[PDB]
């Protein structure tokens, strides 16, 4: 048969009960009354066995979870979303050899981990109040 | 060309994986261990650089509540479903479920407290009320619970009437608002089959239809006895119409 009163995220198994879709959890395994609800599970939040890994953030979605490499890093394989740690391929951006930095002429692009900074050109003096080796460095 | 032990990040622990020394370009990731979770975009690992140099990591864990509580009244609004980090003071919205309505005096919000526990949930969404059931002419209705969403009402006919409809009716989500599964049934009175016509006996006051508890009266013709067998009345059993005794006889 088939049930005609299932909630938002279930499939009719018998005419008397429903079953939660994958990615969604219920407090019972058979949904007897329609006042019970299926809710989305938090694959990202604690405690979740799945861990995305390095330089990667988890993003809970309805019926799914997505790992993506944090900004300042990129995947090698181009594949943005992955499922557990063994698929992590996140690598730091060379912001220097890409030219998409914001240091000025008095400085030089300095590739770091997830970002960059600005060092004085060899033979250049940072103005006294400003600090060297930072994104707002000005030298003379 | 070598590496050494990784730093000690406060409130986090590295996954050494049983490595005494590390080659260059190896990377070890720290993990917030107890009550802490990672900031989005922060650096959770430190790679080993040339000359055994390790990258500097700012503390990237922070106090955090766990997942917003499961509520039967409502669910997390759409922006808030993706979030997995909840520092102290985090507000989250809520929207009422399919068969529920907002109680305007309350707040569709609850925030993270310094006890790493969410603020006490309130029932800011109450169940919808299906319309009033009405009244079955020549029939009863039993409302054991109430008209709120997800309650079944039963249907009953008065004696001598027969229902042609659904035994009960329950109220379920109907597009925007709630509504009853089954319309109101109809009670129709049972009719006794036909009045037997007596030989040499007139039947007083015939009507077009004869219902329940009705007694049909006989009289004998002139010169005929046994007018005192009385009359018969209309009885109904399990939807079948029966006359009580045999029809009286004229002699
Ligand atoms: C960790 O969480 C706390 C709040 O639980 C953040 O506190 C902020 O602190 C700054 C000053 O240091 C205040 O001006 C902000 O108003 C605070 N925000 C809140 C929501 O209380 C703290 O910054 C967090 N640490 C981070 C983000 O690294
Ligand atoms: C639902 O239907 C299946 C198959 O008809 C049955 O095995 C199961 O027991 C049913 N659930 C009940 C009766 O609660
Ligand atoms: C998790 O990673 C392991 C790596 O050993 C892989 O075999 C497995 O398929 C992954 N799990 C899922 C559900 O993809
Ligand atoms: Ca999910
Ligand atoms: Ca970089």
Residue numbers in the entry:
A (entry chain A): 25 to 164
B (entry chain B): 34 to 284
Give the text the authors published on this PDB structure:
Herein, we report the structure of the adhesive domains of the CD97–CD55 complex as determined at 3.19 Å resolution by X-ray crystallography. The CD55 and CD97 bind roughly antiparallel to each other involving each N-terminal tandem domains. Structures of CD55 and CD97 in the complex superimposed closely with prior monomeric structures, with a Cα r.m.s.d. of 0.9 to 2.1 Å and 1.1 to 1.2, respectively, suggesting no conformational change is needed during binding. In CD97 or EMR2, EGF2 and EGF5 each bind a calcium ion in the N-terminal tip, which contributes to rigidity within the interface of EGF1–EGF2 or EGF2–EGF5. Our complex structure reveals two N-glycosylation sites in CD97 (Asn-38 and Asn-108) and one N-glycosylation site in CD55 (Asn-95), but none of these carbohydrates are involved in the CD97–CD55 interactions. The preeminent interactions of CD97–CD55 come from the EGF2–SCR1/SCR2 interface in the middle region, which buries a total surface area of 1278 Å2 and contains six pairs of hydrogen bonds. In the third interface of EGF5–SCR1, Val-137 of EGF5 inserts into a joint hydrophobic pocket formed by SCR1 residues Val-60, Lys-76, Val-79, Ile-80, and Leu-82 and EGF2 residue Phe-79. In CD97, the Pro-71 and its preceding residue Thr-70 adopt a cis-peptide conformation, allowing the Thr-70 to flip its backbone and form a hydrogen bond to Glu-99 in the CD55 SCR2 domain. The majority of the interactions of CD55 with CD97 come from this SCR1–SCR2 pair, including six of the seven total hydrogen bonds between the two proteins. The overall architecture of the CD55–CD97 binding mode together with structural details leads to a shearing stretch geometry, which is known to resist force applied to the protein interface.
The adhesion G protein–coupled receptor CD97 and its ligand complement decay-accelerating factor CD55 are important binding partners in the human immune system. Adhesion GPCRs are characterized by variable tandem adhesion domains followed by a common GPCR autoproteolysis-inducing (GAIN) domain at the extracellular region and a canonical seven-transmembrane (7TM) domain at the C-terminal region. CD55 is a GPI-linked membrane protein with four short consensus repeat (SCR) domains at the N terminus. CD55 regulates the complement cascade by inactivating the C3 convertases and plays a critical role in inflammation and pathogen defense.
